[PDB]
Structures are given as C-alpha cells and as structure tokens.
Amino acid sequence: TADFRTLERESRFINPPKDKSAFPLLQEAVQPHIGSFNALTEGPDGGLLNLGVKDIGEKVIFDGKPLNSNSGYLGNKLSVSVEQVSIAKPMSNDGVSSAVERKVYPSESRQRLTSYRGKLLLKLKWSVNNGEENLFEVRDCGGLPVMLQSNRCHLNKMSPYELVQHKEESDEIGGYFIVNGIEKLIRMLIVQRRNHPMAIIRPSFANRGASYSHYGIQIRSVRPDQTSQTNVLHYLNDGQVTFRFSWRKNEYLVPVVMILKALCHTSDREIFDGIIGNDVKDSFLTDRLELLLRGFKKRYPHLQNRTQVLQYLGDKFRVVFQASPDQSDLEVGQEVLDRIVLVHLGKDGSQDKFRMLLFMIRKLYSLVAGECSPDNPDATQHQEVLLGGFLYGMILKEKIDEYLQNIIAQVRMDINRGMAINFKDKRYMSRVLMRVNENIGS
Amino acid sequence: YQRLRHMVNDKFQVRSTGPVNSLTMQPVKGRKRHGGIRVGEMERDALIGHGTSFLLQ
Amino acid sequence: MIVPVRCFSCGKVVGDKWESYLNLLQEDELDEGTALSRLGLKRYCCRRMILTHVDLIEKFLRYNPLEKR
Amino acid sequence: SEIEIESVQDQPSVAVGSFFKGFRAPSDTTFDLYKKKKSEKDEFVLHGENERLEYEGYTDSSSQASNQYVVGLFNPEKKSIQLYKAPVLVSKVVSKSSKNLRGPKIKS
Amino acid sequence: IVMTASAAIKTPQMTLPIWNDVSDEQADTFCKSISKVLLSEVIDKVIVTERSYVIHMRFFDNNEYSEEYDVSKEELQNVISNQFI
Amino acid sequence: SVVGSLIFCLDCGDLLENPNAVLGSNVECSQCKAIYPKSQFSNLKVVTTTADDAFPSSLRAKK
Amino acid sequence: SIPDGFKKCKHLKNFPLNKQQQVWLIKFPSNVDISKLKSLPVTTMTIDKHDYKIMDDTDIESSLTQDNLSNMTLLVPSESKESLKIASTAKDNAPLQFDKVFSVSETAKIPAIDYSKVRVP
Amino acid sequence: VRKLLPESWGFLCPVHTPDGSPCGLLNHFAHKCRISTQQSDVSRIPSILYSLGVAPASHTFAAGPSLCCVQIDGKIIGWVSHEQGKIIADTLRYWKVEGKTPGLPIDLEIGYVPPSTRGQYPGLYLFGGHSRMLRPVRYLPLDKEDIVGPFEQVYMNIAVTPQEIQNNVHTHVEFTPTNILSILANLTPFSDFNQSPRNMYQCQMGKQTMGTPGVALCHRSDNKLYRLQTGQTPIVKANLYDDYGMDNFPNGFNAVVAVISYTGYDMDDAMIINKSADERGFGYGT
Amino acid sequence: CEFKLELAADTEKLLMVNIVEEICRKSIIRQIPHIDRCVHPEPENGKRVLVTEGVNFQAMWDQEAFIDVDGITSNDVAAVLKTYGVEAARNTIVNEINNVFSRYAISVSFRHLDLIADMMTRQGTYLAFNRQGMETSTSSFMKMSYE
Amino acid sequence: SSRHGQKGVCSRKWPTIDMPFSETGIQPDIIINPHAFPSRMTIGMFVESLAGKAGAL
Amino acid sequence: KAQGRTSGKVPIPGVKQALEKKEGLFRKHMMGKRVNYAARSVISPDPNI
Amino acid sequence: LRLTAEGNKWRTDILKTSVDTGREAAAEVTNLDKDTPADDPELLKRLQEILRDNNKSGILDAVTSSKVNAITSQVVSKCVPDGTMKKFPCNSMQAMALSGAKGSNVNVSQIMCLLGQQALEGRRVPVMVSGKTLPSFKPYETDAMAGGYVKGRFYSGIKPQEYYFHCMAGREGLIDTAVKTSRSGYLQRCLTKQLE
RNA sequence: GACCAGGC
DNA sequence: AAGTACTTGAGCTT
DNA sequence: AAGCTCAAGTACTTAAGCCTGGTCA
Ligand SMILES: [Zn+2]
Ligand SMILES: [Zn+2]
C-alpha cells in the first residue's frame, strides 16, 4: 500500500530539481517523437537529411552551343546538384543590420502568435563539363519549424530548475510544433512491415485484368533515406507472373523474366536451379516454370544478351523518368534497377536482388499450391508504426527535388526565349536563382 | 469524483428571430449567431401521424 | 490550489490546521494517523480535507512577472 | 568412431567448384587458379578456358569469414585420412558463342 | 423483401409436408437423393500422364456410394459417356 | 540434360525448343551453338498427381 | 582478366587419388587450426577442448537415392602443377562425386530454471 | 479491421479507445511499449551465423519450404534445416541476452517460424531497422530483462505470473501483468471488477475532465482554457499514479457519498448535490 | 476407370489437371432443375415437414405419392407469384415478415403487415418500396424529392 | 462522473438540513441511486467506497 | 457533363447540383425548415409535477 | 452480494467439474476414444488440420458451447437465491432483479456466481494462426479456459486472460450498437415516403 | 464548403 | 463495396 | 443471310437525425 508523500512533495514544489527531472517515465513515453526528429540531423553518417539529399544525384540540362564542328555535340554541360542540408537553431536578429543575434525562447513564440522556427541552409553545387569547373555556394530556404525538447531547440538539456527561469512548465515534455501559435503535432500511422514480402489475397487483384487471379506477393521496401517504394507480383491464371510498380501516381506492368536477366547475366538453367532446387520430383513445379520460361522467348524473339535487354528497357522508359538526352538508354535501363526494383539492397545489390526476387517467386507458387497460408494483413503481426519525424523528413527530401526541378525549368525557359547564355559566369547564376521561387520553409 | 465539460451554459438557446438567411428568408443556423432549431424528415412524420396538420402547417 | 477554509460536509473550520499538520509531520516525525487525530479532527468527513490536500499554489508563485529574474 | 589424420596440407593443392548438377567439361579443359592475401583470409578466383566455353569462379566473401573448407582422402583399410585445404568457388559456364551478342543501344 | 423486389434472394427455400403413413426411416429414404450431384463427388484422385496425355480416375468402392448418393454403375457410365467429353 | 520435360544445353543455358520442331537430326542452341543428336529419348511420361484441395466427398468428409 | 592483388597459384601441391578409397568434403569453422588434429568420428567431437558437432550433410550437397545429382565438382592439379583439371576416377572422365560431405559446427547449452527461487506463493 | 485481435497482446491497449465512429481505429500503446528509432549494427551478424553452421547463400543452390530460411532485413544470408534453425534461434537468443558476444545488441528480434501443416511459410528472420515495436519481458533460463517484438511473440510461450509457469513449456514471463494496459487504464481503481464497456467509457470520460491544464497559465495564449480551483490527491490510488506524477495536475475532488434512494430526483442517471457543499467551494471552476 | 486421349504432336505444354479439376466440378450428373439439397427438420409444434434449398414447384408436383402438394410453402416471393399468382404471394409476404419478428419475441399487429402487403401488390405484381416501384405514381413532387 | 464510468447530471441542489444526517452528524455530499448499479455491473465503485472510508479514518 | 478544369479544385456546383444531391434543395429547405419560436436544453427529472 | 460461508463451497464444487470439460468436446468432434489424453500427438494433428477451415472451427465452437453453457445452469440454479447471505426481501439486489424495476437475473448471477462463456460471432475466442488463443497458452489447447470461458465473477475479480477476453465481447457490443441504428434508420425513410 | 474533434 | 438496372455482340435459327 | 434471345460487359446511384465548436484556404 503506497503513501501520500506529503513532505517530499512540498520539497519538490518549493525547490524544483536542479539536476535531472524527477519523473523519468514521463520523459520516456514521448521518446517516439523526439527520437524521430533527432534522427534527422544526428547519426554517424549524417542522418536522413544529408543522406537523402544525396540520393537525388544530379539534374542535367543542355545549352546547345554549336562549337562550330547535324553535330551530335550538344554543347557545354550543366550539372546541378545539392550537397548537404543544414538546419540552424532558432535565432532572431533585431530588425536589420545583422547585429549579433539572440536566442528565441518558446514562451516568446506562444505569446507573439507566430511560429517557432530555426533557419534552413543548403550548399548548392553548380558544375559544368562534368567536373572541369564548378561553383560552391550557399543559400537560404527560410524558416523551418522545429520540435521542442530536441537537438535543434534551445530547451534541450536544461535542468527543471532552469525550465522555470525561462518561463516554462516544470516537467514540460514538449514533443510538438508551434505553428502560428497553435500547438500542432504529427500522429503515428500504421503501414506495412518494411523489408518483408507479405503473401496476399485480396479481391481487388482480380479486376486489374482479364486473367488475374486474387493471389499475389507484396513487398514494401525502404532505403537508408527512409523513402519507400512498393513492388507487387501478380499471378495470372495462364502462368505468367507479372512485376508491378507505382511511379508518380501511375502504375506499370513488366514481365519478371525480363528483370531477372536484367539484374545479372544469367541463363535459365540457373533460374530453374534457384526456384525449384532439389524439388524436381514435384510435377506442379516444372510445368508452371516451363510455361514461365517459354513465355519470354517467342514473345520477344531477339534478346540474346543482358545489354540488349537493358536498352529495350531504356527505349520505353526514357520518356517517363525525364532522363537527359545524352544518356544512352543502356544507362537509363540501369537507372530503373536502382530507382525501382527492390530498392533496399542498394545500387550494388544486383547479385542479392537476383536471389530475393527468385525467393519471392518460390513463395508465390507455394501460395498457389496451398502449401502455405496467406498472411493476414489486418493483424498487428505484419504491422509497424510510422513515426512523426520520419514523415517530416521524407517531405523535405521531396521538396528539395521539386526545387532543383524548378531551377532546371527556369533555365530551360531562359533558353527558348533566346537570350544570351553563358554558363561560366557565376554572376549569371546569382542572376538565375533570384528569379526562381525559393522558400522551402513556408 | 471528477467534474466534466458540457456545462449547460454552453448548450441551450431560444428562437431564431434574429437575422435570417438571405436566399430563402428563413431562420439562419445558429447558437453563436442566434439562429433557430430544425424541424426534420422524421419530425415531419410525427405531425402527420397524429392527424394533426394545422399544427404541421 | 490552497487550503480550504471550511470542510464541506461537516462545516468545521479546517483552514488553520494545515500549517501545524506540516509542522507535526516534520519535527516530531510522526505518521499521518496520529498527526490528524492530535489536531482534533474526528470524523472521517473533516480528515479527508487535510489528509489528501495538494498545494499547487506553491508552483504558481514561482512565476512572478513583478520582480527581476 | 576413431579416425587418424595422416597429413594436412596448408598450401594451394586442389579447388572445389559448384557449377550445377551433372556438370562436366570437355577432356582438354584446364583451369587457372588465382590467390590474394586479404587480411588473415585467403580469397580465390578461378578462370578456365576451352575452345568454345569460358569458366569463371569466385570465393564467397561472406561465407569465407566463418567457413573453412577441406577435401579429404579416406583409407578404410586403415583408420586414416588425408586432408587438403581447398577453396569453394561459386562458378559459372559462359558460352563464347553468345557471350557478346547484343542489341542496339535503343530501338527508337 | 420490402426494399428490394429481388427475384433471386440470397438463400431461398421450399417447405414440404409429408403423409402420416410414411415412416421416419422412409423420411431418410425418399429425399436424401434428388439433389444436385457433381461427378467431383465420387472422384478420389486424378492422374495425368503426358504428343498425348492419359487420364486415370480411381473411384470409391461401388457398394459404398451406391447406398449413399444412390447412383449405380450403369447411369454413372452413361453420363461420363456423353456430356463430359 | 533432361529434367521433367526441361532439356538444356550443357554449355550455354538457353531453353531448347521443341525437338520435333527442329528439322535437322541435331538440336543446336541459339547461343553456344553446341550440337545434340535428335533422339536419345521419347518424351517423358510426366508423372502427375495433384492435391486434395478441390472436391468434396463422403470419405474425406469422414476420414 | 585477373583482378587487383591476385597472383596465379604457381606450384600446386600433390593430391594422391585412385573396399576402395573415398573422397570427402569437410567444413570446419574458419577459426580452427586444422593443421593440428588427430581424431575424427563416423554425433559429437571436441577440437582443442571445445566441443562441436559433426553432421552428415551429404543429402544437401547431393542425392542419396540417385546418382549424378551432385552440386560440387572436384578440381585437381594437372600434369604441370600449374593448373587444374576436373578430377575423375571412372576411366570415362565422368567427374568425381563426393562420397560424403561433413559439417563440423559448434553446439550450445542451456541452464535449468530454479523453480524454488522463481515459483513463489 | 475493428475487431480486437489477440496478436496485439501487450502492445496495443485492449481497453482504451474512443467509441463512436472512430471506435476500434484509434489505439494506444501499452505504457511499456517502446519504438526503436535507431539503425542497429548488423555488420557482425553474418560471421556469427556462419559459425553456427549456416551454409553460404552465394553458392550451394537450394530452395523450397522443405528446408529452413535464415534472413536479415531483406537479404538472404543462408539456408539451414528446420531443427538446425531451432538450435540457432535458441542459441543466438541466449548470446543476445547474456551479453558476452559483441556486435549483437538486445534490440534485435529473432523470429523463427517452425514449419507446420498449411500454416505460414517458415523461416528465421532478423529485424534491426527503424520504427519497430518492442516490449520487455523476463527471460526464464536466466533472470533478466529481454526484448520481444510483435513478430517473435506469436510462436513463444509467455507466462503471466511466476505462479502459473509450466515446467518445460514457458521460455519467458512478464515483469508485471499490468504491462498489457495503457496509462489511463491503470488510473482506474479496480478495473477488473467493472464490466468492460464501462472501463472503456471511463477511459474516454477521464480525458474530458475539467482539470489543471498547466502551471504556466498566465504566460500561455491558448484560446479556451478550463481549470479547476481545488484538486486533491485521490485516496484510492495506483502506484503508477506516482511515477508519471499526476499529482502535479490534480484532476478531481473526493466526496462523502451514500448509495440510497431518498430524494426522488436522483433516479436513473441523475444525482444530487448537498447545497452546503457548493456554497463552501465544492466543484468550483474557472 | 481408365481411358486415354490424344492431341496434335506439335502442341504447347498447356495445363491439364487444372482443366480436369475445372470440368469435374461442373459435371452435372443429375440435377432436378434449381434444387440443391435436402434436410429433414425436426417435428416442430406437431407439424411434420421437409425443407429443400432452391425453388422448383413443377418438380415437387410429381412426388405426391410421398409428399403432399397442397401444403407446399416457400420462402420466395416471386416464384410463388409465377405459379400460384398474386394472392399466394400477398399471403406469403405476411408470413415472411411475421417470422422475422417472431424470433425476436417482439410483436407487430397484423393490421400493419396487411397494409404493407396490400400496398405492394396493387399492380398485380410484386413491387419494392424503392425507386423502381415508385416510378408508376401519378404525382411528381412525391418522386421529385426522393432520390 | 466517477472514475468508474458513471456519468450523471446534478438534478437539484438539496438543502443541507434535508440530507439524511448520519449517526455521527455528517451529511453526505452526493447521493447516488442504487438502481443504477445492477444494470451497469460496477462493483469497483462499491469496493472503492470501503477502501475510501478505511483510508480516510 | 462538363469537361475537366485543371483536373481538380472541385467544380463550381451547377444549378443541377442545387437540386440533385444528398440534401440538395428539396430535402433541406422544404421537407424541413429551421423555425422561429423553439428552444432547446438539457433535461432533469422532476417527480412532483 | 455475498454468498454464505456454505454456498461458496458448492460453487467451488460444481466449478471443479469443469476442469476436464474441454477435452471431452475435443474427442467427440475429432472422432477418437473418449479417454485420449490432452497432449497426445495424433490428437494434436486432428486438432491442427481442423483449424484451417472456417466451417470446421465453427462446428467445434458450437460443440463446446453446449457443455460450458450446461455447467452454468448447473451452478446457478443450485446456488442463488438459496446461497445468498441476506434473503429477499432483506436483500435489495434481488429485490431489484425480482421486481423488474431495473436489471434482470442474468446481471445478478454475473455478480454473485460467474461470467460463463464468451461469445464472438457465436464462436469461441478467435484463434491466432499458431493455435495459441493468447500468448500465455500452450499451442492447440484443448482446455475450456482456452475458449474464453471465464470462471471468475465481477465480485471477487477476474484473472488477466479472462479480462482480456471480456474486453473483446465488450467491443463487439459497441461496434454492433453503432451499426444497428443506421441500417433501420435508412429503411424507414423508404416506407414512410411512399405510404405518406 | 473541405479536414480533425466532441454529445445522445 | 454491394447492388441494381441498362446495353452491346456474336452465335444461332428461318 | 438475316433475324432475335442469347450471353457477358459497360455505365450509375445511396448508403440514420440532430447540436456544439475547432482552423483555414
Ligand atoms: Zn467536515
Ligand atoms: Zn546451347
């Protein structure tokens, strides 16, 4: 039977703790949010910000300077790319003049009825001729809201005795955002288990085509940058198993035997070794697999080499991804296999992807034959939680993309008007960026 | 014991005879702006059901 | 927030017995049982007022706009 | 029960290749083995050549961190065995005929 | 009923009274049969052997399902003999 | 060479077409260009027995 | 196309081939000095006072019931000791198949629950 | 999707959800359920897996549900037999707990799924990634705190109390059986005597109370702020009412209450208040 | 039972045992049309009855050496209208809506369930109360506010 | 409301003298009708009563 | 019946959506009406009257 | 609400006869000898394959519900009213049950006697894929407690597994009370519109 | 008017 | 998603 | 050849009554 603790209480009220808070469990229940938002800038490798903005790579556009050689020469080349992303703690100068700035505490931002924001900064790398000459420069994308009690807020590490001095709640746990005076926070969502290949049965797999059955294999994959990609395998009644992905609010369909040979140079005797293995006795297998192989031949009479497959991919897929006119389709075919198929294994993951995608297929036929039961998608067994900060870090990575895209668009419009264009002029750049609309924060 | 919200001071009101809706010249929706209460589809069958109509009209 | 001046049900004035209850708890290191019963609180009515009370005002006073830090 | 160990070879002698089941190569075929000293682990690469086929093979970087492989010669008219260290190489057979076949960069 | 007008309800039924003299064992006699009967009911397993292919069908013991589903070797041959193929 | 109606060249790995659709007495891969005689075999019987999933019954609804 | 750091294995040591003799494949943990052992069973064994388990993984590398279903092919030094040939015994050049494949792997133990200390009224 | 599934024992609170249209959709984690925001070190997992007898995946072709599968985070490390994978998933479990093997933190899940008849496709899984659910237990062979995930839970035997543990059956036990509830399902006194929909309604009402919103009230600009003038620490108390420190925020007031039919205004859901309690300050608010 | 088939020497590998599994389960040996199955219910309330799923009257009419043809009642509204006419349907509807409220122990005076039933059959056929039956009414403003 | 999930409305402020006064002189604060319990099945309130009195004494 | 404008933004509801949906115009402002001379409040038991 | 010092003894006597119940329902469905022990393997296989179907488990649950519901009316009719400590009229709770003023016999017997079987869609506790009804039970448990049958009572308390079962039966109620009203809520608008 | 709340 | 009523096409009969 | 019931397949609509507020483009 517990007690009231009348003395120890008034001891706490009168003199608040000067070392660490007295209620450890109250500060450990909010850990989901602070952990996520701290995970952005911290971590040995630079967090989600510095790794994510690296994923975008380069954006390419061409000037068309003839050089006076019909000429396949497209002119001096422009490579726009970001490098790192940094976030500065909340700071406010007094008006103009850039006098030595002072900190802004939350209790000032609740009363003033504006947001509590730390600054955002980009290091934008501007290159020509693929690394002969380049320009390092820094810019300003505006103010970025910042979680309280985290590494980018000043209240981090203060002891409860100094949470009072700055006019806060003694135990205050923060863990939310101040938007225009309101306290807004992100709430947790339940998505599918990352990096696991669920076996599915849904009626909606049936209506997508004539011969589609309701069996299927679904994998949701996620990169070191926490961005996600969805990959599905549908089983047609006539034995064809199709690969499916979703891009820019579109859906596409590709035969799987294409991608298997696309990943690593291979010949079908090894595929049959991979799927069936030592099970050659069973008749339900060799039949389905032979109707699977035969289908790729005589559908596309000429593909004798991995490269001839890659280029065939590049022809159809050159348009959507908006690749630069210089890249040979051979390359773009390699852009796909990095940017879509089974992305969580990296850009060197060809050899491992070739195993994973086989293992799925085996587990799909084992689902058709009834040897294994379909995973229950409603249950908590297959589910995880998607934290607030890990949502807040995907979006910024998407907006930097739309930013670079917007610059590239501005230069292209600068071309077709016909104005003089010189890419070795830094002052030309400082002329360019202002015309573009740069505020990410707002 | 715990006291809750939903004090009656928040919930009650009377008439519509303040301002009226502009389109249909009807009682405006209300409380904060002092509008009326809504007769309704099923409430319309309680009128007819008794046979009472002068009270319906 | 602060000590109530009258016990609700009984009506006796329990408002002056909080300080001395703290003193009795502190100096002589008694328990809650004998401390309440020494002040002359008999009914289980008037005992719950002092026994369970919370001074939250001590936390309010810490925030004073009218003095320097 | 009990088996005595006559000899144990520490040096490159034989090698082991997994190609596929029922694998064989023409009579002449001959395989060149190669070796690198990375840390205190030994990596191996295999390259074979005949008139119309190539053969290549590598040691699995991941398994060789925790698996050591050894070929044994057994004398059952004795309680004896002769162990030789051997790498296991993951290997393929490539047809010289179709290796370099290739379509155009794009069928535009 | 009310809302639909539906000509095909989910689970229709009929209701059959019977004479008094008909016994309770004759109850199990008359209507057990005269039900929808698929050939898939009497088939224990199928073997397919492959250019041509062969079909084997190993049924149950005739005496067994002769008493239950009330079908005899004669009709069973005729139905397979025509509409199946 | 032969597994369950699948027959593959010993050099390259491509899938051999119908042995009967090849006119010459030697099947030749489209890659390695290796040669096989036509008939070492009749087409294999493909032993096939399938699951108990489908059908209802009297006995399996008992046993 | 030799990669960086590899040198061709010049002088290949000798491999004496041939109730007749048998050829085995054996996996040991990489941390085990094989050069100093003595025993070997035909269950359990200890090497350097630490204990391991020997498993007959022959049915994984090959088929027990049917011939020519072997994953692995043995390569022995050729008549120059500067290259390798597929090891055969059949006077038919039919590749040698391993007679047995053994996996020497580590084993673990668990401690019993003390129900006196743990199952309390 | 609105049913209460038994696979959620110990993570999602059974009792506490708001009813109405949201009922069943919103959930709250059991107050000991933690969510991991860090990427654990997977570097040295493969070598240990190899020294436990896992054959390399890069070679030695094999496949089929007939034999075990061992994976990490979406890479296939190796294939081993089922009763091998049980010796592994048991051993690796223990080396995780005792802590004498480096590069193998306790947060890692070990998910071994035994092959069965027409159940889930078997395998052995290792998940070190972000945003996974974890709850503590007490590992029986030793006595220590351990971490169990939602995926490795369904196949392992977790006893509720040390009195109920069967010999040769249970490999784990809860710290305390209250670890399965949420914060506000603990703050109900004797929640096991009441009927369950009543516990749920309580969980909802307790969030509508007129409480102490904060001590900062003079510096805070919020639009509408309810506060109660006088609180009291309740007499009937849960021990978790001390740890989270609700006493900095007293939610209500004790009362001397009699169960009787006397007045005649108090029937069904109505109640009566002594008139000299109010005028003396009982229930006041701002 | 054993027999053989043959096809073209040049053919595909097309799946067979699936075809067999498909044709075996449509293999209608003997089907008295629309009948499904029989169950002998309990001798309830002194009445002795048989019940079969599916509705076929013209088939049940030949069994009268066994089951009586005058007391055959149905759970369908329409099929009784195809045979016995609007009157046996109007009488059926009441006995269907009754048996829903009889199992809940509730009670609804038949003066209501008669007015509904007579309000459906006013056209000689069986009309719903939804959009499709209200189509034939005279007044617009009733229909115009419905859907 | 209580912590056991009894939501209720103050009906009338009842004079102090008309409350039934205990043997000891304590008028109750809040009267609650028994007939509410056997439908709602709350025994935690009956038990919290005793645990409250024995605690206050 | 109107072709898309910027594929989104919602259409500006037309005169046929004035009287052709959910509440529309025939069942909002006719089959029921907000009314003068009406009140609303909480109820409390009185055994006396 | 209290039983006598005698009546509780009866209660514990007639409940102890339900310790072995579930297995006897496991034998009659699986077609074995009535004495087949609980952990026997070939028993476990039949208990295993029977699960993957919805219909078969729907049969087994209706088989056990008969027995675990029989035990209930064996206990209650023997215990209350003659096991009560205060006899009606002196006892108020029964005066509320008997007089029909509020509540009914079931609500009193749940306080004074036992909860009885839990029912979700007419069946027993929804079974996880691994054959465990809840993480604390051995896989494929023949026992009666593994179907949600609760021997506890709101007066003396209910064990953790019991409470976690009763939460389900509590939620199903609220859900269905949400789905009912709208359904008949729409139907009635069709009738009154045409019969207006 | 669109999204979260909340009451029977 | 559940369900109805409406509508277009190629086989089949005079 | 041409007619007309045949069949599957392609569009189209509704889905309980209230009251409170809350921020926002
Ligand atoms: Zn008092
Ligand atoms: Zn070939």
Side-chain angles (χ1 to χ4, degrees), chain B residues 1, chain C residues 44, chain H residues 256-274, chain J residues 6 11 14 18-23 26-38 45-46 49, chain L residues 92-93 96:
Chain B
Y1 283 90
Chain C
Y44 66 92
Chain H
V256 174
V257 172
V259 174
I260 185 172
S261 294
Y262 179 81
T263 55
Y265 294 78
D266 58 12
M267 293 169 65
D268 67 24
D269 288 346
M271 65 178 283
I272 296 300
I273 294 171
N274 186 337
Chain J
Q6 299 293 102
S11 179
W14 191 254
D18 289 346
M19 294 293 293
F21 62 93
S22 63
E23 184 71 12
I26 303 167
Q27 288 93 0
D29 289 344
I30 287 170
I31 291 176
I32 181 169
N33 186 329
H35 285 85
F37 293 86
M45 186 168 176
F46 289 163
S49 175
Chain L
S92 297
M93 185 62 69
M96 294 186 282

Side-chain angles (χ1 to χ4, degrees), chain E residues 1-9 11-43 46-59 68-72 75-77 79-80 83-85, chain I residues 1-14 16-17 20 23-32 35-38 40 47-57 60 63-68 71-78 93 96-97 116 120 126-130 146:
Chain E
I1 295 170
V2 171
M3 288 295 298
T4 58
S6 177
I9 55 177
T11 59
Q13 290 186 338
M14 293 188 288
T15 295
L16 300 176
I18 62 175
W19 292 98
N20 291 337
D21 60 353
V22 173
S23 65
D24 291 344
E25 184 178 3
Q26 289 179 335
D28 288 344
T29 302
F30 165 66
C31 196
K32 185 175 62 62
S33 63
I34 68 170
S35 65
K36 185 175 180 180
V37 175
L38 297 174
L39 180 63
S40 63
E41 293 180 351
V42 294
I43 296 170
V46 173
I47 296 99
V48 173
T49 58
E50 295 299 323
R51 183 178 181 273
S52 63
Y53 56 87
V54 182
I55 294 99
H56 291 80
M57 295 175 182
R58 301 289 181 269
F59 292 164
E68 185 67 14
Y69 294 139
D70 187 5
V71 174
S72 64
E75 295 174 349
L76 175 60
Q77 180 60 258
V79 176
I80 296 171
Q83 64 178 20
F84 180 83
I85 300 302
Chain I
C1 181
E2 180 178 1
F3 63 90
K4 183 179 179 180
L5 293 177
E6 295 178 352
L7 294 178
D10 52 351
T11 307
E12 294 82 358
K13 194 178 181 179
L14 63 86
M16 290 305 298
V17 64
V20 175
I23 305 303
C24 291
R25 292 193 298 275
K26 293 176 180 177
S27 299
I28 295 171
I29 296 172
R30 176 185 60 199
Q31 183 177 356
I32 301 171
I35 294 173
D36 292 344
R37 186 178 179 83
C38 179
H40 177 60
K47 181 60 174 173
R48 185 179 181 176
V49 173
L50 289 174
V51 172
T52 61
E53 294 180 351
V55 179
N56 189 342
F57 289 97
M60 294 293 103
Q63 304 307 322
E64 66 178 343
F66 293 152
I67 60 174
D68 189 7
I72 295 171
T73 57
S74 174
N75 193 31
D76 182 4
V77 177
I93 283 170
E96 295 179 354
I97 291 176
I116 285 173
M120 284 188 280
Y126 172 70
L127 296 175
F129 284 93
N130 58 35
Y146 182 74

Side-chain angles (χ1 to χ4, degrees), chain A residues 190-357:
Chain A
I190 291 171
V191 298
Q192 187 173 356
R193 179 64 64 86
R194 51 179 285 174
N195 294 337
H196 192 280
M198 285 176 69
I200 305 302
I201 289 174
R202 182 170 296 110
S204 180
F205 288 168
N207 295 131
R208 293 181 63 82
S211 63
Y212 291 148
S213 62
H214 51 74
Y215 297 90
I217 298 298
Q218 188 167 355
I219 177 171
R220 180 177 179 273
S221 294
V222 61
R223 301 177 182 83
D225 295 341
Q226 292 303 320
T227 58
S228 63
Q229 185 63 59
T230 299
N231 299 131
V232 181
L233 296 176
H234 301 291
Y235 173 71
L236 283 71
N237 287 281
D238 55 353
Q240 294 176 335
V241 175
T242 62
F243 183 88
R244 183 175 71 87
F245 59 88
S246 178
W247 180 260
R248 303 292 181 190
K249 293 177 179 177
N250 293 286
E251 292 178 350
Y252 301 100
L253 293 171
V254 177
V256 61
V257 175
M258 185 175 287
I259 294 171
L260 293 174
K261 292 176 179 177
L263 294 178
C264 295
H265 187 278
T266 188
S267 62
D268 289 347
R269 181 59 182 168
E270 182 64 15
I271 291 172
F272 177 84
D273 291 344
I275 290 172
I276 312 304
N278 293 334
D279 286 341
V280 296
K281 292 292 181 64
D282 188 4
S283 178
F284 175 80
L285 297 174
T286 64
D287 298 344
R288 305 292 190 273
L289 190 147
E290 178 174 358
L291 290 175
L292 178 64
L293 298 178
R294 294 286 175 82
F296 177 72
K297 290 179 178 178
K298 74 182 68 181
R299 181 69 63 183
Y300 301 135
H302 58 287
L303 294 171
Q304 288 181 334
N305 189 339
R306 180 178 180 273
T307 299
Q308 294 180 337
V309 177
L310 295 176
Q311 291 181 337
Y312 175 76
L313 292 175
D315 183 70
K316 301 298 184 180
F317 289 100
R318 184 179 182 174
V319 176
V320 174
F321 300 165
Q322 295 176 336
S324 64
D326 64 350
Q327 289 182 334
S328 65
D329 288 347
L330 171 62
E331 182 65 15
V332 172
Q334 186 59 59
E335 177 181 0
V336 177
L337 302 178
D338 287 346
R339 188 178 293 275
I340 296 171
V341 172
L342 295 171
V343 293
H344 61 283
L345 294 177
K347 292 186 173 73
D348 288 343
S350 296
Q351 190 66 59
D352 290 343
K353 291 180 178 181
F354 180 73
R355 295 179 184 82
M356 175 62 73
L357 187 59

Side-chain angles (χ1 to χ4, degrees), chain H residues 48-96:
Chain H
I48 301 168
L49 293 176
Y50 297 145
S51 66
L52 295 174
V54 173
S58 63
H59 63 79
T60 304
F61 60 91
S66 63
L67 63 87
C68 174
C69 181
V70 175
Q71 295 182 339
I72 293 171
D73 286 340
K75 181 191 290 181
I76 299 170
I77 301 301
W79 302 95
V80 293
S81 66
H82 306 288
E83 292 76 354
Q84 183 68 58
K86 183 178 179 180
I87 296 168
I88 295 171
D90 188 6
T91 296
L92 203 147
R93 176 58 56 84
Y94 180 81
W95 294 354
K96 180 177 77 178

Side-chain angles (χ1 to χ4, degrees), chain H residues 9-11 32 93 96-97 134-140 143-149 152-153 156-159 171-176 179, chain L residues 135:
Chain H
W9 171 269
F11 298 103
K32 303 303 286 186
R93 176 58 56 84
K96 180 177 77 178
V97 172
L134 299 175
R135 70 179 187 87
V137 295
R138 183 177 182 173
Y139 184 75
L140 290 177
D143 186 357
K144 289 176 64 180
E145 180 175 0
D146 187 4
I147 301 300
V148 171
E152 67 181 343
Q153 184 171 353
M156 293 177 181
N157 297 337
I158 295 170
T171 64
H172 291 80
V173 64
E174 294 294 322
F175 284 99
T176 60
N179 292 339

